[PDB]
């Protein structure tokens, strides 16, 4: 006979702060799944007219968003009611969502660039929006937050930041950027990057490379990708372009099929708006018109819509 009862679930007395979260070396959902970020970035900051490009990501297959923020230093501060706004479409459209501030975009070269610790504030200032929203949204403090000019400076305010989000009652997984413009051309994340780990006392960190005409060869793309693997340390690809520019042509081949073969996560730059469309998915913002780039990402090989799952909490 069955035991017939009813009763009702109150919900777990204990329970997690951390949603997403690092597993040895992976990205984790909180109910313990592997997950492998396939995105878009979008220029929300810019282009505040343009916020249905996130259902027309979500459409893609794409299971996650990098929205660009400003912190005020640079740009115009996306204030809390607008990123409460941003965060909940997402959620709306079933994409994990990875917020970042561009002010600090080539820090200690561009005289109008801002710092890992101004960042940090608009982030602590976004707290009553952001916690609870753990399972949902990545903290990626400060887009490509160094430039060329002595690029070692890069570790000392990086692990201050995160030890001053921690510090504020952060526990969402943070996201962190390289010098050299996102590009680590010197190595100093590749090397720095167990100390600036182990700073965090949550282990729920993650490295982002952003790869560009540094990464023009195979070997390039793969040495990179297998440090880091190799090291136990998680990491993304939080940006990357593939067209030839006056630097080189970047290799986007060996960056989408070694980031299948390794399960780690992309993010492609950009669905539309650059200054110059070359990287634009999307022209003019048009899911019709679909740029030779958008092309390859979207449709061709360990492309988006190929290879990218939903992420299982929703
Ligand atoms: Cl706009
Ligand atoms: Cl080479
Ligand atoms: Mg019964
Ligand atoms: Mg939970
Ligand atoms: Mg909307
Ligand atoms: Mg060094
Ligand atoms: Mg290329």
Not at 144 to 171: M, S, V, Y
Not at 190 to 207: E, Q
Not at 209 to 219: E, F, G, K, L, N
Not at 229 to 244: C, H, K, R, Y
Request: hydrophobic content about 40%; glycine content about 10%; proline content about 4%.
């Amino acid at each position: 006979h069955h035991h017939h009862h009813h009763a009702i679930a109150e919900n777990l007395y204990f329970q997690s702060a951390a949603g997403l979260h690092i597993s040895d070396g992976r990205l984790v959902e909180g109910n313990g799944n592997d997950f492998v970020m396939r995105g878009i970035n979008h220029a929300h900051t810019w282009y505040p007219g343009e916020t249905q490009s996130l259902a027309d990501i979500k459409a893609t297959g794409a299971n996650t968003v990098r929205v660009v923020l400003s912190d005020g230093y640079r740009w115009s501060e996306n204030s809390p009611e607008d990123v409460a706004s941003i965060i909940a479409r997402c959620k709306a459209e079933r994409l994990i969502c990875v917020l970042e501030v561009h002010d600090t975009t080539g820090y200690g070269e561009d005289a109008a660039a801002g710092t890992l610790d101004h960042a940090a504030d608009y982030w602590i200032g976004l707290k009553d929006v952001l916690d609870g929203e753990e399972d949902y949204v990545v903290i990626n403090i400060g887009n490509e937050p160094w430039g060329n000019a002595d690029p070692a400076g890069w570790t000392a305010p990086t692990t201050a930041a995160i030890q001053k989000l921690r510090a504020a009652g952060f526990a969402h997984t943070i996201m962190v950027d390289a010098p050299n413009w996102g590009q680590d051309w010197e190595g100093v994340m590749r090397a720095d990057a167990r100390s600036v780990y182990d700073a965090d006392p949550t282990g729920n960190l993650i490295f982002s490379i952003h790869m560009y005409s540094v990464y023009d060869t195979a070997a390039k793309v793969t040495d990179y990708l297998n440090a880091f693997v190799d090291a136990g340390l998680p990491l993304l690809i939080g940006e990357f372009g593939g067209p030839a520019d006056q630097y080189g042509d970047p290799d986007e081949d060996t960056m989408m099929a070694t980031a299948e073969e390794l399960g780690l996560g992309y993010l492609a730059w950009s669905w539309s708006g650059n200054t110059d469309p070359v990287l634009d998915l999307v022209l003019d913002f048009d899911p019709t018109r679909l740029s030779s780039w958008g092309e390859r990402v979207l449709h061709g090989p360990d492309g988006i819509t190929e290879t990218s799952r939903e992420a299982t909490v929703f």
